[PDB]
From a paper:
We first determined the structure of Pseudomonas aeruginosa GCC (PaGCC) β subunit at 2.4 Å resolution. The structure confirms our hypothesis, showing that GCCβ has the same connectivity between its N and C domains as that of MCCβ. The overall structures of the two subunits are similar, with root mean squared distance of 1.2 Å for 464 equivalent Cα atoms between them, consistent with their strong sequence conservation. The overall structures of the two β6 hexamers are similar to each other as well, with root mean squared distance of 1.3 Å for 2,866 equivalent Cα atoms. While the connectivity in GCCβ is the same as in MCCβ, the linker between the N and C domains has a different conformation. In addition, the C-terminal segment of GCCβ (residues 526–538) contacts the N domain, while that of MCCβ contacts the C domain. The long helix at the N-terminal end of GCCβ is disordered in one of the three β subunits in the asymmetric unit, although this helix is fully ordered in the GCC holoenzyme structure. There is a large, mostly hydrophobic pocket at the bottom of the active site in GCC that can accommodate the larger geranyl group. Interestingly, the side chain of Phe191 in MCCβ is located in this pocket and clashes with the second isopentenyl group of geranyl-CoA. The equivalent residue in GCC is Gly162.
Author numbering:
A (entry chain B): 2 to 81, 89 to 216, 223 to 274, 278 to 461, 469 to 538
B (entry chain F): 52 to 81, 89 to 147, 152 to 216, 223 to 274, 278 to 461, 469 to 538
C (entry chain D), D (entry chain D): 2 to 81, 89 to 216, 223 to 274, 278 to 461, 471 to 538
Write the structure that this text describes.
Amino acid sequence: PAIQSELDVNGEDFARNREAMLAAVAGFRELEQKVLDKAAEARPKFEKRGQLLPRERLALLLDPGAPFLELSSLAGYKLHAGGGIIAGIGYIAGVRCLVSASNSAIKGGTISPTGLKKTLRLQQIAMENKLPVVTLTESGGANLNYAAEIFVEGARGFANQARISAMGIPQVTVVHGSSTAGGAYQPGLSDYVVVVRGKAKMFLAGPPGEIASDEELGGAELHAQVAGTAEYLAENDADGVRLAREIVGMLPWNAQLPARSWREPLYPVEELLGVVPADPKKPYDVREIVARIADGSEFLDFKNEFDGQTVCGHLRIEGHACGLIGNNGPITPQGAAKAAQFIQLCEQSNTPLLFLHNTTGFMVGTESERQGVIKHGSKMIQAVANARVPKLTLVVGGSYGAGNYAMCGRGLDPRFIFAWPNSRTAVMGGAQAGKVLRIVTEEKADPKMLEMLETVTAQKLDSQSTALYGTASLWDDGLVDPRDSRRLLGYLLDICAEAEARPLKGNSFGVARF
Amino acid sequence: QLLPRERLALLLDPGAPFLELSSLAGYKLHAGGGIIAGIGYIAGVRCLVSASNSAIKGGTISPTGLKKTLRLQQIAMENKLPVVTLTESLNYAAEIFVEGARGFANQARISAMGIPQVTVVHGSSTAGGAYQPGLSDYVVVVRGKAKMFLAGPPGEIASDEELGGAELHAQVAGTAEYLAENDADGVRLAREIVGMLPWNAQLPARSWREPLYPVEELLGVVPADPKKPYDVREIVARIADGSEFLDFKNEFDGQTVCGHLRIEGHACGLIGNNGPITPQGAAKAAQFIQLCEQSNTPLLFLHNTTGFMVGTESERQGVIKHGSKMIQAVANARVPKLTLVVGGSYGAGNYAMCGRGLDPRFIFAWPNSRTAVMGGAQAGKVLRIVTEEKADPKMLEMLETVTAQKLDSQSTALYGTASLWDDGLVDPRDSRRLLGYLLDICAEAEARPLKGNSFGVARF
Amino acid sequence: PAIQSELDVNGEDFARNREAMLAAVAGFRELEQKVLDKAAEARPKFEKRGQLLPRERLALLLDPGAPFLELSSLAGYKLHAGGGIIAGIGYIAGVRCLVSASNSAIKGGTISPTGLKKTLRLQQIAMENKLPVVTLTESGGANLNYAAEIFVEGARGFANQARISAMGIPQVTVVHGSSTAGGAYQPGLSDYVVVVRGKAKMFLAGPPGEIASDEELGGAELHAQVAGTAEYLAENDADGVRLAREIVGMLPWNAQLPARSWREPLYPVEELLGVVPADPKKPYDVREIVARIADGSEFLDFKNEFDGQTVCGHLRIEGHACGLIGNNGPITPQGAAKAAQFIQLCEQSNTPLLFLHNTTGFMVGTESERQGVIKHGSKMIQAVANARVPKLTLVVGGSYGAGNYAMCGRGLDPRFIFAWPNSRTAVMGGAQAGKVLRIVTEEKPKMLEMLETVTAQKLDSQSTALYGTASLWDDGLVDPRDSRRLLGYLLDICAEAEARPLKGNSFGVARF
Amino acid sequence: PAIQSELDVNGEDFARNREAMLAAVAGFRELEQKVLDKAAEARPKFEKRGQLLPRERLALLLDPGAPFLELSSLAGYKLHAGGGIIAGIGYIAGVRCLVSASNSAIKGGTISPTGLKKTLRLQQIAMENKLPVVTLTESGGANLNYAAEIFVEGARGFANQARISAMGIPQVTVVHGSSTAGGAYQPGLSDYVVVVRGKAKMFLAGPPGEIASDEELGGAELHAQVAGTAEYLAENDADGVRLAREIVGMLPWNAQLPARSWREPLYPVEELLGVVPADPKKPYDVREIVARIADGSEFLDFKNEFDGQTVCGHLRIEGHACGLIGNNGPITPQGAAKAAQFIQLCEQSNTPLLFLHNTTGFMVGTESERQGVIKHGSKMIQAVANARVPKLTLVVGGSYGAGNYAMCGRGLDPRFIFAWPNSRTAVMGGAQAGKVLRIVTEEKPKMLEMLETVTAQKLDSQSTALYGTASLWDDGLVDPRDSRRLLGYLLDICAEAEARPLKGNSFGVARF
């Protein structure tokens, strides 16, 4: 049952693949460092104020040496980076939570339209995986430039917070700072609010016809003792973070769970750096990736005889059974039928699905259409849409057009989706897009215009298809290093298994702050 | 052959009501989003009906095309309406495509929920557009017009009829269940599919006054713009059966109005603004919604507000916490929630009065209304102050004497309904018969049992 | 919308078909009467005892001119007929019940394998359709020929009675005669027992070291006054039936339902006698049957262009929306696929399914196999087996081999299955069977040209409707002209069951 | 607390009993082997083809030295043995499955009435006990002797497969040989099909106007590559079984369960050979059986003073708390009443029930009848039929007539029923039966003193354990000394089913 790798670790293919992937990883880890440097500018200006930086607060919030998975760290990159939020999934007092912090250190917070989207998305992760939501809030509010592309749709964040509370998923918010206008409802719709003495203020309209101090209009002490909008008053930031840990640590949260050994892979995950060809067009076997993420490198291959371009099978990752769907060519009618069936089978055995995209879309042509490519692809999509088992997507290569849909891309609601930095997501390949514009224009003509239309269109598309663009549009939950792929999937499966097992005390209207 | 609206005239029941939705979607954002859509009747069955508008530059689907399809799907799901679509159909597509998958995911789920989809293909449905019939339950194909393929002929050379014609799909592939001879025969066949379902037989079995004043002179009730604290009760009087209305907790707060009325036999509870929402109006409102959940009474939100009250008093008297409670009820209440934007809808006042992002079941706007993040009033103050103190009336009060009247002027209904901030604009004089129809839709859905299945109906 | 028939109304082949069909009806109808006749040749013994005959019992129990659907009247025709039971769905005091009387005018009641089988099936019908079970009992014991062979499996009937009580479906039993040995438990596991004085005895062992009058042992008065195994003491058969109506009449059974308009067909239902070729080998279009059962003769044909040999489509029957599946040729991969889709659609709309069987089975050959005939036939079976909507089968013709399965024959638990008299059910055609039996054994002199088409002639024994109804492969034969009103009645029953709430309990009602 | 046995351990009657019992075990065990023997007389034909024999297939599929409970090994012993099936509950990769292999070393697999029956019963066992169904298939078709008699009811097996898939109980099928005609649907309605290359064929009709290689028609490669009716292509029998383990091994099946310590009996279980009088007519105390199966030999006797002829009480078996009901005499009104109460109590505490049958049935006579024997027997049956807790039956002795019913014999759906070899199941004792048949006919010369006790001798044919196990009246015969570990294993299975959640779906998994 173990996969035989055909991979040459002291060879010219490998080393150049390692080279091109390390280039990509460094490439995105550089962009990350850049945001970090930009938030050391504010350090002294924070330290003047006796305030910890956002990531200093998280460092004190989180249990030391505990796994932390950060999400959408580059969301919104150059669209007006991280969306104004630092969020992730980690531990707070042995309780796995969705942890958030206004990135105050850059643009005093400020929340971009991709900030709306990221918040919506983190809320969906909190809901689906039943994670308590801990927020260290200190924000400027949304960019004034983007009222319209935000305002009405930004009510959904509040709607969600009201629903999370009724679902029985506790919200704890430390207000380190400003929480003004519309965004004062973010602590207002949390269950447990901590307010920092002197360095904190919530109100709908600030001072700038009545004349008032900010502390007297909506400062900490005002809330903790007059209006009752908070439950705890904290001295400073460290003490605020202490209290967030106290709260969390006083819930009997892990006690609600019921009470409930594996072989490592044959090949080391290090090797994943050289598995994808540097030559993007060059085919390879998704099983080479599988062999380095699966326990014992063991993969039970499903229906490979019927079709080899859509690869299905079973494996374990750190003990957890899953079903895998990956791509070694276009999705043919047979491939979609196989996949649909495989997904219903995993539904039947309560097996989580893992989708590794390297998809170029569906096979096309008269044979394909006459053999049911539409009807079979529809059934695959139906199966992905309707399966209730957890779906985990890893974009390892292509994610093109309807292949993206069929392999459980963002719009199909995977539990989690992460992308390799070599990956590409796009409505189609550049070459196909440009070719087609040539052809419809070749009739609706100067030969050079055609050539230029085709090729420019192509480079334009292929340029946009970069992982960076995908992740920046929240087409994924984040970029990961290929070598993290196994331990990431381990963590994510743990997350989904506990969610399945956890009972919640729901209520009609959400907890009422009387 | 027939045109978009000609198909619809023929699809729908002669003289049955028909409520059209987001007519002006995407107006000047480049209108109606590629789609003529609404709620009407086919063989006695109330459906969500939608037809490609190929006239207006071939239709197209685009940022508002996607929003409008997503929104219509939500309306079909929450109100349990069979979806009957007459389709025909790259500018925006690199950008929209990932999120565009939600339309397909929804189709798969709607099929699993037990709400059938009937699609007539009158023209080309290609690449991604091929999956909307794909993911329909009943598919009618028009002989020699319809074409379905993941890739049209634009390195094989095939004719488009050889590759995805009506006859290929009806006869060989099995992609469709019916072959129609022309536009009108497709439409007929769709009516017959609808008329052949036991849909209304799934429901259980089941008199009023009319208001005192005519409901046909109401183009004069609201002044031009809407910010004015003018009287929502005036409107209530014109919508409410026998103009009878029972003020609720009026004496506790005068500005946030609340009470019961009966529209066309249907009880409901109204939440209105004649002013800002103070911390008492909000408590009052949260309480009332909660009472309405208790008695299973539907909610009407008349938007005519500028936001919550502000000042040290409001903040001391718990405006955040009572506003929060009002949002909690708006969000978690299960009774249907109907919204009419009659005037101002600003800031967190739009949210708390159940504006779009609080998912009213249905939300409609008066042409005179204005939805927006804040007022020109507070705009020039922010722009000023965010450059001021981040020394003159040259670049202090010049910014407000301009920025006020940029937004306090532009802030059009039209932008809201184009951004899909509402489900359309309606003549204010239509408001009673409108709400009457929406309540009836909401009630039919409350009573309708569906037959769900695990994976959607498979077209094997 | 409507179907346009092309079968010549004043035709010749019509009149031919019409004559042949009428001959088959007359045949089985004749045979029904001869079981009535044999029962009537005990009017003296009954009249002497002062008893009503089973069918007089039933005519008094049933409502005046209400529909009454008799079930499995020829069951067990020759396997030693009707099982020793007369049963059906009719009306007692406005309530629709599963009604049953021991046929004690024939061999004195008495139960065999076929009687066990008919009883389990009746019990399934009541369970699935939520029908109060009214039983006019008078047997004694089972055929001693088979008792030892059968007594273990016979316990399932008692198991079912206990479970029916726990489901909240009342059982009313009038004991008109003897019910002794293990059959004492049939009244024993009923909820309401009426016991007729002087004529009625229940005990686990009759007189055959103690000596006793069978009345001292277990007569009506003993069970009503001393032991308390009965609830009502009736004076005579008529008084017993009377008490059974009054029990049904005092239930708020119809009050449990919620509260709740059609065109007739354009072509008279009488025409259904002359629709099926007199020559069964001739092929006909099933839509010609459809056009006489469907309101307005309207029929929406589904996916006909993908495969016209498995016909599907929608219709209304007395306003009831249904989906129909028929055969105009063998079942192809495409037809199976299509039918499986169609059943899923009907489930999705909560639309009942009608199966008109005229199959010879599935298409064969490398192409069929290559195109997925097994996988697709499999999906059609999955859909048939798992669909929640009511499934009604009318065997109108062929029902052979795997096509029998795929079209919701017995083993797939249709809710009801009635066969037309020309129908034929068999593992295959006699021709098909001889040939094969030739060619397999042929290569494992003159014995081919005869052993072949001699087995073919036999196989058309285990193949007439009669052998089918007798084996309980259908719930009865019916005159084709009843087909519309039949399905109407079945649809009503199915719809009422769907809507009806029941008061379950843990152990059944306890006769303390 | 403990029971104190008085059966002489170094006794004579013990040794007598012990010898007689051992003779009956040896008997049936011998007969089990002779079915193994007849299968082994095809090692050449298998070895030539390069096949593993059914039992080699099964030994490779099962986990090393895990328990394996074989079911209905003598089914159909002489009604033309084991059904053409070898089946049981054992372990595949840690998972407990219902495991089945076509017995294609005997008459080439092949299915009859008894094979239909054994299959429906296996399917019930899997459904009720939530066991993945692993099937190593190789048949061809059914006995052509019975195919036409049986093909309609045979569809129920396919119905069950479709429903098992919809329940969320996975079916894994390795096709080692042919599965043609209607039996193509057995792999067709399985969730995972493994098809062995070269040896394996599925088609609806084999070559016998088109001409084709059976491989062009439906061989492994065709179904795996072209049609897609299989999921895995195995090289050989061993490789197929291999793939079947790996499928089971990759399910998170045991991960679905929640997480979860006894005294042995004071008296060795071996002693159970010498507990039952060699002379069955002799009466014994059932507590002597109890004292060897119960932990600590402890037994809490329930309501013994009300009636000591129906014994009830509580015990633990490998820590499992159970309630037990046995027979030390016929069933009185008081004993029925008591047993019915006892079952209700066991339900209330969620305590499983063991039925040890040694009944001759119910008490008779005017007093019995007067004291409510029918009503009370009825309540006992209601309780047996309706109780939700697992019911396990061990036929240790007599199981006659209505006592068979009341003690949860076959027709009351015990979850499992195994019979000891001395056991006897019959509508009554042969003596009882002759006498009666005398006296009824006697008054309706020399023919009494012989027709009487000649029918008595016959009736002890339809009465040995063998005729019972062959008719599927039990799930198998078992060596009395296995009784404790048997019940242990059954209790575990029942407890795991209770606790196990399933992923239902609407139509079963679709092999698109």
